[PDB]
Design an enzyme around this catalytic site. Structure first.
Site, PDB file in Angstrom:
ATOM      1  N   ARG A 157       0.838  -1.212   0.000  1.00  0.00           N
ATOM      2  CA  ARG A 157       0.000   0.000   0.000  1.00  0.00           C
ATOM      3  C   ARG A 157       0.864   1.249   0.000  1.00  0.00           C
ATOM      4  O   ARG A 157       1.648   1.469   0.935  1.00  0.00           O
ATOM      5  CB  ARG A 157      -0.960   0.053   1.173  1.00  0.00           C
ATOM      6  CG  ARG A 157      -1.912   1.262   1.042  1.00  0.00           C
ATOM      7  CD  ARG A 157      -3.169   1.172   1.886  1.00  0.00           C
ATOM      8  NE  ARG A 157      -2.937   1.272   3.323  1.00  0.00           N
ATOM      9  CZ  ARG A 157      -3.907   1.276   4.226  1.00  0.00           C
ATOM     10  NH1 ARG A 157      -5.170   1.166   3.839  1.00  0.00           N
ATOM     11  NH2 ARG A 157      -3.629   1.369   5.515  1.00  0.00           N
ATOM     12  N   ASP A 438      -5.036   4.235  13.600  1.00  0.00           N
ATOM     13  CA  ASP A 438      -4.142   4.761  12.571  1.00  0.00           C
ATOM     14  C   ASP A 438      -4.733   6.049  12.020  1.00  0.00           C
ATOM     15  O   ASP A 438      -5.678   6.591  12.598  1.00  0.00           O
ATOM     16  CB  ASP A 438      -3.778   3.723  11.497  1.00  0.00           C
ATOM     17  CG  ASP A 438      -4.944   3.279  10.662  1.00  0.00           C
ATOM     18  OD1 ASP A 438      -6.071   3.785  10.843  1.00  0.00           O
ATOM     19  OD2 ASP A 438      -4.711   2.401   9.772  1.00  0.00           O
TER      20      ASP A 438
HETATM   21  O1  LIG Z   1      -7.802   1.698   4.983  1.00  0.00           O
HETATM   22  C1  LIG Z   1      -8.521   1.361   5.946  1.00  0.00           C
HETATM   23  O2  LIG Z   1      -8.180   0.464   6.760  1.00  0.00           O
HETATM   24  C2  LIG Z   1      -9.748   2.137   6.166  1.00  0.00           C
HETATM   25  O3  LIG Z   1      -9.730   3.347   5.784  1.00  0.00           O
HETATM   26  O4  LIG Z   1     -10.716   1.610   6.751  1.00  0.00           O
HETATM   27 MG   LIG Z   2      -8.001   3.795   4.663  1.00  0.00          MG
END
Ligand SMILES: O=C([O-])C(=O)[O-]
Ligand SMILES: [Mg+2]
Ligand SMILES: CC(C)(COP(=O)(O)OP(=O)(O)OC[C@H]1O[C@@H](n2cnc3c(N)ncnc32)[C@H](O)[C@@H]1OP(=O)(O)O)[C@@H](O)C(=O)NCCC(=O)NCCS
Ligand SMILES: [Mg+2]
Length: 524
Positions: A157, A438
């Site tokens: 990613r 996060d």
């Molecule tokens: O990327 C992810 O984990 C989200 O935004 O839920």
């Molecule tokens: Mg995300």
């Protein structure tokens, strides 16, 4: 030419080879201007929403949506993705994730990583060593970590289109982080990935439009051609995690048809984007964060539409993650696993081909749910949801009303401040109050507080939410944080800097798009 603002150490000499830098330069020069135009187009499109035209499906592209066509293809090693683990690109983490009871490891340069220069470079080193099968790590205690037989499939990613990589400049400006992360993972690993029957695979975040998907398609085609690879060698899974993007899923799949193998319901970014995108609509205010769950109509509609749309095109429809951390207490962990099981069962029963976890302690639970519903099959591509009536803009945009509580506001302050403190200290994923935080989850918390202030919403106890109330609660919640963490952890941290940034973004009259943008100014 590119300029590098930091002197090369041994790690840069490995990753930023002359040849890598030549390739990166080509991508930057060919694609950065278009990337900037795409970021500009976002401004205008949001202004149109701000000025009173809610999102809906695109008129002119009706023929694409009502035509029969499918994506180019899915590689053999991406046919079964029933569980994917996500984790940042730290060395021990990469080994543990690849060794987990899952099908895929999504190595993250995005929301779970604070993009310090050293961590981005080390991340590229770690993924190369992982692709090459040699990655190893020995800790302080002398325990060695190596890949076990049959490691998970690797997907990378990259940073989103808005993020600068400020340690590499072109024409006096930071280059796009998206191009940096893509170029280096692709360049260093395509040969070995292809040799072993895999390929260069990516997760693409935060897309807002099909034109952005088209740009990625151009980037991928250029990269393939540069190294004489067949078209569609690079395969991407694209998160639908912005409110504009849920209206353009078919156009996105079409624009990336040679490279795309799936969409993913990035629920946390999606909720964040719901608030940001509908910031000027007082009836679209979301409640306490913990109340915004996937069973709510607007979110269930998003998932069911994504599933139907992906499967119509022969693409995967990947689920997301619940963000609960397993507990070291058995009784408490039982409750955590039961709620994780419930969350996964909803996804599997709806037709998602697989799901995400962010901790190996959740793998057995997630695997059991998907193993049960998949049976002898590898995925759910055949599930077309023909029972479903059309899903409309009104349904996707539906308000979602619920309690806005003082406890909810204070929790959002504590979460946002602690996330910012960790991030500016180089830690992009941290456990807080039994939840994995996060960037996206913290983004919900900070954007929600702004939204309640913006619309002068009242809390359930009658207290009007104002900048004044926030400022007082901020200082009060800092005392709570200090008390929870203890004097040593709190004093040695960056809570002063974090509270300052939190206060700035929260009390601004305009809603800043991403906390990571001002946050990056605090990184070396
Ligand atoms: O990327 C992810 O984990 C989200 O935004 O839920
Ligand atoms: Mg995300
Ligand atoms: O420390 P900690 O995060 O409390 O470790 P936990 O007991 O919760 O997790 C157990 C393991 O899962 C690993 N882990 C947690 N999340 C992970 C992720 N998303 N990807 C890879 N490994 C992960 C930890 O590194 C730890 O590995 P170790 O036992 O070899 O040290
Ligand atoms: Mg294994």
């Amino acid at each position: 030419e590119l300029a590098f603002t930091r002197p090369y150490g041994e790690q840069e000499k490995q990753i930023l080879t002359a040849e890598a830098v030549e390739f990166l330069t080509e991508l930057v020069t060919h694609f950065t201007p278009q990337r900037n135009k795409l970021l500009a187009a976002r401004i205008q499109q949001q202004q149109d929403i701000d000025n009173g035209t809610l999102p809906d499906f695109i008129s002119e592209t009706a023929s694409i949506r009502d035509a029969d066509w499918k994506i180019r293809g899915i590689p053999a090693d991406l046919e079964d993705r029933r569980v994917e683990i996500t984790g940042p690109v730290e060395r021990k983490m990469v080994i543990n994730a690849l060794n987990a009871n899952v099908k895929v490891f999504m190595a993250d340069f995005e929301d779970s990583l604070a993009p310090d220069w050293n961590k981005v470079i080390d991340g590229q080193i770690n993924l190369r060593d992982a692709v090459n099968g040699t990655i190893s790590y020995t800790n302080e205690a002398g325990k060695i970590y190596q890949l076990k037989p049959n490691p998970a499939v690797l997907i990378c990613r990259v940073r989103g289109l808005h993020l600068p990589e400020k340690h590499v400049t072109w024409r006096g400006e930071a280059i796009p982080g998206s191009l940096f992360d893509f170029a280096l993972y692709f360049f260093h690993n395509y040969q070995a990935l292809l040799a072993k029957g895999s390929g260069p695979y990516f997760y693409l975040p935060k897309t807002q439009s099909w034109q952005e998907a088209a740009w990625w398609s151009e980037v991928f085609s250029y990269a393939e051609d540069r190294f004489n690879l067949p078209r569609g060698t690079i395969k991407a899974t694209l998160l639908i995690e912005t409110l504009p993007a849920v209206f353009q899923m078919d156009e996105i799949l079409h624009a990336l048809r040679d490279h795309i193998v799936g969409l993913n319901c990035g629920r946390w970014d999606y909720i964040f984007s719901y608030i940001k995108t509908l910031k000027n609509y007082p009836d679209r205010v979301l409640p306490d964060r913990q109340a915004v769950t996937m069973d709510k109509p607007f979110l269930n509609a998003y998932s069911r539409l994504l599933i139907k749309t992906c499967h119509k095109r022969g693409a995967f429809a990947m689920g997301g993650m619940a963000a609960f951390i397993p507990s070291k207490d058995e009784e408490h962990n039982n409750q955590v696993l039961n709620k994780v099981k419930a969350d996964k069962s909803l996804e599997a029963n709806n037709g998602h081909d697989g799901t995400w976890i962010a901790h190996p302690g959740l793998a057995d639970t997630a695997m059991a749910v998907f193993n049960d519903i998949l049976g002898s099959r590898k995925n759910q591509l055949e599930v077309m949801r023909e029972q479903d009536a059309p899903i409309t803009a009104d349904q996707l945009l539906a308000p979602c009303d619920g309690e806005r509580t003082e406890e909810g506001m204070r929790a959002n302050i504590r979460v946002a401040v602690q996330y910012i403190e960790a991030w500016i200290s180089g830690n992009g994923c941290v456990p807080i109050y039994g939840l994995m935080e996060d960037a996206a989850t913290a983004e919900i918390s900070r954007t929600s507080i702004w939204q309640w202030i913006h619309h002068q919403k009242t809390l359930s106890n009658g207290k009007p939410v104002t900048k004044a109330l926030f400022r007082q609660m901020l200082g009060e919640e800092m005392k709570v944080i200090a008390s929870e963490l203890g004097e040593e952890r709190f004093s040695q941290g960056r809570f002063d800097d974090a509270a300052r940034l939190m206060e700035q973004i929260t009390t601004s009259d305009e809603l800043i798009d991403f906390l990571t943008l001002p946050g990056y100014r605090l990184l070396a």
